[PDB]
Amino acid sequence: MRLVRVNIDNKEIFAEEGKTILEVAHENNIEIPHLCYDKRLKPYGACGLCVVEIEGSPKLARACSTYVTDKMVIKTDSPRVRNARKMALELLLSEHRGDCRPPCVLACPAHTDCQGYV
């Protein structure tokens, strides 16, 4: 078929027209964060973790809903993108209540999984 040419993280990729940046990067083993995406569902654009920097666009684009076009240059780990993802994650952690690890595990100097083996 007709193939679009993209540049994701300095790597030239011949992708297929009609895919999103998330799918193209998944195929080429490029990790883009995502929390509200699912291949069975229409895009939602909520979390804002999949934002990538596309050369020629002043605003970061969601990789889950943006489609790859011919002669595209994409950065997925630029400082702007990292700052955006860090701020989104901090906002998400702002409204979060939980224990990733129990206090017993954190009090062990060797961090033995006390809860796990108990």
Binding site: N7, E12, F14
Partner: protein, 118 residues
């Protein structure tokens, strides 16, 4: 080399210098494919090449002065953002002094116009 072989298929303009297709036939095939995909080919050589068939500009030079004039032309048409180059490069004023007295030819000016427009 600065870039990879794949980016040839996606670049706007290709400048092939020397017997690129003669010494490396597969590179001649790659240039043919890239021009078919939408690139623009400029061949600089001292004789005939198989890449001249689909080239938009063909230059038969024998001296380095052709490039120097080009540089001067690039300065005359204000195609060099000296603010950026001064931060990223040194010896810029020496380059300007070196190429100030050369004569800009029609071929050199056309090459400079092709370069600046890509």
């Amino acid at each position: 080399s600065t870039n990879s072989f794949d980016e040839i298929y996606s670049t706007d303009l290709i400048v092939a210098v020397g017997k690129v297709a003669e010494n490396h036939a597969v590179m001649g095939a790659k240039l043919k494919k890239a021009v078919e995909l939408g690139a623009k080919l400029v061949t600089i050589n001292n004789g005939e090449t198989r890449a001249d068939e689909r080239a938009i500009a063909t230059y038969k030079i024998d001296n380095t002065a052709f490039f120097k004039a080009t540089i001067k032309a690039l300065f005359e048409m204000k195609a060099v953002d000296e603010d950026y180059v001064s931060k990223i490069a040194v010896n810029l004023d020496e380059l300007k002094d070196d190429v100030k007295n050369v004569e800009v030819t029609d071929e050199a000016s056309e090459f400079a116009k092709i370069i600046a427009g890509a």
